[PDB]
Amino acid sequence: SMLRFGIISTAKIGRDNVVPAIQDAENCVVTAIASRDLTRAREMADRFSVPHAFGSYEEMLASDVIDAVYIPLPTSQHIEWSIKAADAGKHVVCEKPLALKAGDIDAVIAARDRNKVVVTEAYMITYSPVWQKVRSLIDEGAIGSLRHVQGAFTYFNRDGLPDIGVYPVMSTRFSTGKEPLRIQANTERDPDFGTDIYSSVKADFDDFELSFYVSTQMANRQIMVFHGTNGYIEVKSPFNANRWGPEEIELADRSHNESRIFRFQDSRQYRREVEAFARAVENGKEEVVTLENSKLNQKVIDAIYRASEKDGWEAV
Template sequence: METHKKIRWGILGVAKINERVIPAFSQARHAELLAIASRSLEKAKQASARYGIPKAYGSYESLLEDKEIDAVYIPLPNSLHAPWTIRAAEAGKHVLCEKPIAANAAEARQMLAVCRKQGVALMDGFFWPHHPRTARLRQELQQGTVGDIQLVRGCFSFPLPLDPANIRLQPELAGGCVMDVGCYPVYGALWVFGRLPQRVFAVGRYQYGVDTVMQGVLDFGEGRAAVFDCSFMLPFRQWLEIVGTRGRIWVPDMWLPPDPAVFTIESENGQRQEVRIGGGNQIAAMLDNFSLALLEKRDPEPPADCAVQIMQVLDALRESARLGQPVTVR
C-alpha cells in the first residue's frame, strides 16, 4: 500500500449500522470513504447517492478488486465476518470488522492468522475503546485511584421486537443477545482486569434458537469476578461499575456515551468526584485510530488478539448457559 494522507476505505454491505458509521467518515482526519458494495447494485447506488460515496459496486468481490481501496469495513452478519475478512485480507485490504469479530473463537483465530500471513491489519469495530473517556478511565485504574480491583459489573440491554426475520434472532447467522450486546460488558471486564477469566457460568432464556436474555459470572481467580447481564427484553441500560478496595468508579453510559461523557469516582469514605470528558464522535475516533496506525505502519490498538479473547469468553458463556454448569475458558 502506498502512503497517503488518508486511508481510502470501502464498505462491504449496506447494513443499518452504516447509518451511524458512514457520517463519521466526514469527521475523521485520516480516513476517506471511497466505495460501498452490496449484493444488489441498486442498493449500493442508493447508499452511494444518499451519502455522497464516489463508487458503488454490485458485489463485494468487485470492491475488493478495486486497487484504490486500502481498507474495508465489514458490517455484515456475524456468520459472514470470517469468510469476508479472509477474502479481503487475501485481496490485500486491511480490515475493520464489526463486533463481535467472528461467530466463534476458532474463526477469529483463523481470521487473525490469515491477516498476519497477508500482512494486513485486523481490528474489531467496538467504538468505546476509542473514546477519550476510556483513556481517562485507564489512567485512573493505573494510578490505583480505587485500589485493587475486585469486582466489575456491567450490562447492555434494550427492548427488541422478537421478529424471527431479524438477523439478531437467527442462529444460522450467529445471533443472540450475548453476541449482539453482551459482548460489551464482557469486553469491559477483560479490559479492566487485563486478562482472561479462568471460568464462567451463565444462565439464559431462548427463543428461535438464540439467547434473548443472559446473565453471567466471569471468575478471574482469587475472589475477583465480573458480573454482567444482557437482554433483548429489558429496558435500555448500558452501564459499567468498577469496584476496588478503596472505592468504585461508576460509568452510567459506558458503551454509547453522550458528549460530554461522564463517570463518577466514589472513595471509600463516601466522597464523590464527577469527571466530564468531551470527546465528540467515538466512531470517527475509531476510524482515525485505525487509519493512522496504517499510515504509520504500526499495529492498530486494541490488538486483534483481544478480539480473539472476547470470542473465547463468549464461546464459554454460550456453552455454560446451554449446559447449566460452569465452563473453563479455553
C-alpha cells in the same frame, strides 16, 4: 493522504454511525460503497458524498479506489469477507462480534499475516477517552484494589444476544488487562424461535468478579461499575455513548462523601476508531484491538455458552 475506505453493504450500523464518522475523520475518507443492489449503494453514496458505488463486493475488492474496507455484515458473514478483503490486499475493520466461536479467528489471523494487512475487530469503545480514563484510573490506584465489576446491557427487540454480551466482557478485559478463569451462567431461550434472549453471568478473574446480565427482550439499559477497596468508577453511557446518555464517569471515594465527574462530551468514538486504524496502517505502532485479543474475548463467550449447560463453574 487519506486512507480510502470501501463499505461492504448498506447495513444500518454503517449508515447511522460509521460512514459519517469516516467522512468526519481527519485521516480517512469513504471512496466506495458496495451492495448486491447497485441502486441502494448509489443512493447511500450520493447521500454521504462518496464517489464510487459497486454492484458486488468482489468488484470493489478488485478495485484500486479503496485501501481498506469496513464490514458491518451479520456475524455469520464476517469471516468470509474479512478473509477475501485481506486476500485482495485490503486492510479490514470488521464489526463485532468477529466470530461465532474462538477457533474461527485462526483463519482471519492467517489472512492478516499472509497478506501483511491490518485486520481488527471494531470495538469502538476501546478508542474512547471514557474507557481510556477508566483504564488509567484503575491503573493509578484510584479505586484501590478492584474487587467487583457489575453491569448490564439490555434492549428490546422481538423480530442476537452475543452482539451485546461481548461488551461487558471486552470492556472489563480492556479496563483491567486481566482474563477470567471460570464462569457461572444461566441463559434463557425464546419459547417460539429458540434463540438466546437472556443471560446472567458471573466471571471469576481471581482478584475480582465480574457480574452482569444481557437481554434482547428487556427495557433498554446499560451500565458498568468498577468497584474497589478505596472507591468506585461508574460509567454512565458505557457502550452506545452519546446515543445513550452523557459521555462521563463518576469516581466515588471510599466514604462516598466526595466524587469526581470526568466528562468527555462529543468524543465521537467511531471517528476515533477509524482514525486509530488509519494511523496503524500508516506506522504499525498504534494500539488497535489485535485479533489475538479478539480470540481471547471470544474464548470467554464460548465458556459462557458451555457454562449455561451446567449447574456450576466452567473453566474458560
